[PDB]
From a paper:
In each case, the process of viral membrane fusion is mediated by the trimeric viral spike glycoprotein (S) that is cleaved into S1 and S2 subunits by multiple host proteases upon infection. Two heptad repeat regions, HR1 and HR2, distant from each other in the prefusion S, drive membrane fusion by assembly into a six-helix bundle. This HR1HR2 bundle formation is thought to provide the energy for membrane fusion and is therefore a target for therapeutics, as exemplified by peptide inhibitors that disrupt infection by the HIV-1 (19, 20), SARS-CoV, MERS-CoV, SARS-CoV-2 (23–25), human parainfluenza virus 3 (26), and respiratory syncytial virus. We therefore designed a scaffold to efficiently determine structures of the postfusion HR1HR2 bundle and its mutants to near-atomic resolution by single-particle cryo-EM.
Author numbering:
A (entry chain B), B (entry chain A), C (entry chain C): 918 to 988
D (entry chain D), E (entry chain E), F (entry chain F): 1164 to 1200
Amino acid sequence: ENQKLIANQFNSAIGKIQYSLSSTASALGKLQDVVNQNAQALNTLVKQLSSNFGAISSVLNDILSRLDKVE
Amino acid sequence: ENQKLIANQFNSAIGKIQYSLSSTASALGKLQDVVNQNAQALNTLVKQLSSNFGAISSVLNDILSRLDKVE
Amino acid sequence: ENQKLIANQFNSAIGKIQYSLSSTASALGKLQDVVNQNAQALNTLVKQLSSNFGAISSVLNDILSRLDKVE
Amino acid sequence: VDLGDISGINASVVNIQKEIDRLNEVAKNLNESLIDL
Amino acid sequence: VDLGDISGINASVVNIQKEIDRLNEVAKNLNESLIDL
Amino acid sequence: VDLGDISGINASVVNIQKEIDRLNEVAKNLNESLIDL
C-alpha cells in the first residue's frame, strides 16, 4: 500500500518534470530563435550603415571638392 | 524503514527540483525581459536612423541644388 | 524487491534530471553570454553612430556656412 | 543621392511567458507529489 | 572628412541546440524511469 | 541642420548568473538525494 503510494507519487512527479523539461526546451528554442534573429538584424544594420556612410562620405567629398573649386 | 528512507529522499529531491524550476523560470523571465528591451532598442535605433538619413538626404540634396545653381 | 525497483528507478530519474539541469545551466549561460555580447555591440554601435552624426553635422554646417558665404 | 533604406530591419520579440507560467505551475504542483506515509 | 568605421561591430549568434536536444531526450527518456510495480 | 540624438538608446545587460549557479548547485546536490538501501 505504501509502495503503491510511493510509485504513484513518483510517476506523477516524473510526469510533471517531463512537462517542465518540455516547457524549458520550448522556451530555450524560442529564445535562441529570437536572439539569432536580432543578431542577424544588427549585422544587416551594420552592413547597411557602413554602405550608407560610404555613400555619405563620397558625396561630402565631392561637395567639398566642388567648393574648393568654386572658392 | 526503507520506505521512510525512500520517502525522505524523494521529498528532498522534489524540493531541490522545485528550487531548480523556480530558478529556471526566473532566469527565463530575465532573459525574456532583456531580449525584448534590446529588441525595442534596435527598433527605436532603426527608426531614428531612418529619420536621420532622411534629414541628411534632404540637406545634401539642397546643398547639391545650391551648387548646381552656383556653378 | 519492489523497494530495489523503486530505488533503481528513482536513482535513474535523478541522474537524468541532473543531466537536464546541467544542460539547462549550460544553455542559460550561453544565452547570457550572447545576449550580453549583442548588447555591448548595440551600445558600441550607438556610441560610434553618435560620433559619426556629430562629424556629419559639423561637416554639413561648415558646408552650409561656405555656401552662405559664396552665395 | 539615394541613401539605402534600412526601415525594413526589424527586431523580433520573444514571448515565452506561457513556458515560464508552466514552469512555475509545475514548481507549485510538485508539492502535490510529495510522499506522506 | 573621415567617418568612423563601424564595420567591426559584429553580433554573435547562439547555438544551444545541443542542450535543447538533451532536454527533449531526457523528457522522453524519463518514461523509462517510471515505476511499474 | 540638427540631426536627431540617438545617444539615449541603450541596451540592457542580463545577469542570470545567480540562477545558473543555483541550477549547477542543485545538479550537484541531487547526489545527496540518491537512495542507498
